[PDB]
Swiss-Prot record, chain B:
Phosphoserine PTM sites in chain numbering: 131
Gene name for this UniProt entry: PUF60
Protein name: Poly(U)-binding-splicing factor PUF60
Keyword Phosphoprotein (UniProt): yes
Modification N6-acetyllysine occurs at: 138
Tissue distribution of the protein: Isoform 2 is expressed in colonic epithelium and colorectal epithelium cancer (at protein level). Isoform 6 is expressed in colorectal epithelial cancer but below detection level in colonic epithelium. Expressed in heart, brain, placenta, lung, liver, skeletal muscle, kidney, pancreas, spleen, thymus, prostate, testis, ovary, small intestine, colon and peripheral blood leukocytes.
Residues of the full protein shown: 118 to 311 of 559
GO CC terms in record: cell junction; nucleoplasm; ribonucleoprotein complex
Subunit structure as annotated in this protein's UniProt entry: Homodimer. Associates with the spliceosome. Found in a complex with RO60 and Y5 RNA. Found in a complex with FUBP1 and far upstream element (FUSE) DNA segment. Interacts directly with ERCC3. Interacts with CDK7 and GTF2H1. Interacts with SRSF11/P54. Does not interact with ERCC3 in xeroderma pigmentosum complementation group B (XPB) cells. Interacts with ARGLU1; interaction may be involved in ARGLU1-mediated modulation of alternative splicing.
Tagged with keyword ATP-binding: no
Domain RRM positions: 16-94, 113-191
GO molecular function: cadherin binding; DNA binding; identical protein binding; RNA binding
Domain characteristics, as noted in the entry: The third RNA recognition motif, called PUMP domain, is atypical and may rather mediate homodimerization and/or protein-protein interactions.
Amino acid sequence: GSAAQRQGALAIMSRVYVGSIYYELGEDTIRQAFAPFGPIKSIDMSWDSVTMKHKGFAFVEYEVPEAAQLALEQMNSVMLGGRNIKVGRPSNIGQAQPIIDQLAEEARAFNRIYVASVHQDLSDDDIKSVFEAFGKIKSATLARDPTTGKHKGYGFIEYEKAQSSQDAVSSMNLFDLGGQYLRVGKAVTPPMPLL
Amino acid sequence: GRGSAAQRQGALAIMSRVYVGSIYYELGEDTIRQAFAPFGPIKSIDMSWDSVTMKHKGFAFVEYEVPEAAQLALEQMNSVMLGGRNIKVGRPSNIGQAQPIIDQLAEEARAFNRIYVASVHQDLSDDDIKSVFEAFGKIKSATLARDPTTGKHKGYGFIEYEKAQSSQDAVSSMNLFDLGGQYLRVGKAVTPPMPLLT
Ligand SMILES: [Cl-]
């Protein structure tokens, strides 16, 4: 995978198909429902010019593949506006699948977990202390706004041992911290995929 | 106290079925069965039928013998690509007032450290499964469901642990564990052991 191919895959991996959206629901409802797994980068909502409304589906785009993966595993069939929404991976890809597979394989070489819904008051050291209860930590870093320096509600933690990362995901996904429920999952891409 | 025997039974039945949509026109009952059987033996499948075009309407309802199988299928078969399309899996939209009983059952289930195990190779026995799983902690019981006529196990069972951490460790370590040639499908129970008893 050339740096360009890998980047193309990462973008596809960051989006999820969302279908069976109740006609009365809009972008804001969707955003609110999918934001817990990472901050939404954008949403492409279907739209019909004659009827003046969406076609019942949308593509939610996240800043990282791990957020889309968690949303995929936790938002499927959730009831919104009286309907059980459907969540899936984009059907397009077109030949991006082998790169995606390669990234998933490369990710297994790291004991990295993705953490979302991290309360604003928590700091890197705070998250680190909490999570090092499951094992020794190589690094714990919260993504930050390049301008402000405030964290964006999510981060990555790398453990020395696989058992530690497995124990952490199992114990911390949906763990109530600071008033919100953390959304935790195993990484689906290696740390510096384009290196 | 939520639900009499009849109400609970009605909920259990709904809990044992999953909606399967976006099925490629060329695919039929057999392909769906083969795709969903890993989570437990399929009891039946209600496939949509158009007739005028003599084709299914692209969706079906797979029914399992137990709610835990439908739960695992729901978590693992969603968006899987079949016939070139990413199938959709969800819970029946019907229910109609069954939701509160289902919630009650899920709550009662948490009082047990019970896990569901599917795709158990025929050669394994109860003591076999038990030894393997007791590596995660002390086991109260390990039982494989059986054909009432033959006595042969039906490829799935339940295991109760003395401690919750044990059951949690087991699900985490054994789901998708390659045993006897197939991959075990493991999950936490969604209903209490004898849901229909007093
Ligand atoms: Cl049972």
